[PDB]
Design a protein around this ligand. Structure first.
Ligand SMILES: CCCCCn1c(=O)[nH]c(=O)c2[nH]c(Cl)nc21
Length: 291
């Protein structure tokens, strides 16, 4: 129950019902993402030779998704052991760093693709619609650097922590403090949420206003950007909602017996796996949309 991490009062929980739902969903997530991302990378690197600016961003998203899917098997192994990391200390920090970095990278590149579509559809005569490959590669490297800059603190903050009779390797704990990590999670949902919603709404409004809904494939494009927004919201909403709920249960009362946390704590991590479904669904909608 109660524990102290870096002079911080936290309430970890190693309960059951975690080795029941999480490993079956994670295994199927891994075995479907492997095939989807392998086909995407095959059609990207080898079978096709044409690099356009939007395709570079799509390839970056695919790389992030593939790395996250590769990282997923270790997560499945961890949750199978009922929260017992049996790998080491360097692999644990590396795994947490990779998880955070490619989650943020997937979100950032999704936002970048949405902004690119917004510029293509609403502002067709802007410069950012005909950039060179050098500028696109520089932007990609800059975004990757921003991600690493935001996650070196996860890379450095701590190692696996002994508790009870086992060891826990986690960064999404619950503690009575508001560090940069949780605020960064809330930002990495909300700000891209606003950007994506604004871009999608403007795209829909401009396409409908300019009398373009008559065209056939444009209707498919509209429905696909709509389902992209919907799936992003569906995949990233339960996690942030449970995080806000546990924050509220933390500020009001808090640091108590902490059993009241557990009823919602199990709700958090399950929904966390739901975010990986996002990584699974992007190949279906993003790359697999050519008529
Ligand atoms: C590799 C074991 C980490 C377990 C806790 N954890 C985390 O610390 N950061 C995460 O991004 C994350 N995602 C999911 Cl699922 N579990 C997570």
């Amino acid at each position: 129950h109660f524990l102290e991490i870096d002079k911080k009062n936290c309430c970890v929980f190693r309960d059951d019902f975690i080795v029941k739902v999480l490993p079956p969903v994670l295994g199927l997530e891994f075995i479907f993402g492997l095939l989807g991302n392998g086909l995407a990378l095959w059609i990207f690197c080898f079978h096709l030779k044409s690099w356009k600016s939007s395709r570079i961003f799509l390839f970056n998203l695919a790389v992030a998704d593939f790395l996250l899917i590769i990282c997923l098997p270790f997560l499945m192994d961890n949750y199978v052991r009922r929260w017992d990391w049996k790998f080491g200390d360097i692999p644990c920090r590396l795994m947490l760093f990779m998880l955070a970095m490619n989650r943020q990278g997937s979100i950032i590149f999704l936002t970048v693709v949405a902004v690119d579509r917004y510029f293509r559809v609403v502002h067709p005569h802007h410069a950012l619609n005909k950039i060179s490959n050098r500028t696109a590669a520089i932007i990609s490297c800059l975004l990757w650097g921003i991600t690493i800059g935001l996650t070196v603190h996860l890379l450095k903050k701590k190692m696996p922590i002994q508790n009870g009779g086992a060891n826990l390797c986690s960064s999404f704990s619950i503690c009575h403090t508001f560090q940069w990590h949780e605020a960064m999670f809330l930002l990495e949902f909300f700000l891209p949420l606003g950007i994506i919603l604004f871009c999608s709404a403007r795209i829909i409004w401009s396409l409908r206003q300019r009398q373009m809904d008559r065209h056939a494939k444009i209707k498919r494009a509209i429905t696909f950007i709509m389902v992209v927004a919907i799936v992003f919201v569906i995949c990233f909403l339960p996690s942030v909602v449970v995080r806000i709920r546990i924050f509220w249960l933390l500020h009001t009362s808090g640091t108590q017996n902490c059993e009241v946390y557990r009823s919602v704590d199990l709700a958090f991590f399950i929904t966390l796996s739901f975010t990986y479904m996002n990584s699974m669904l992007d190949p279906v909608v993003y790359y697999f949309s050519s008529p």
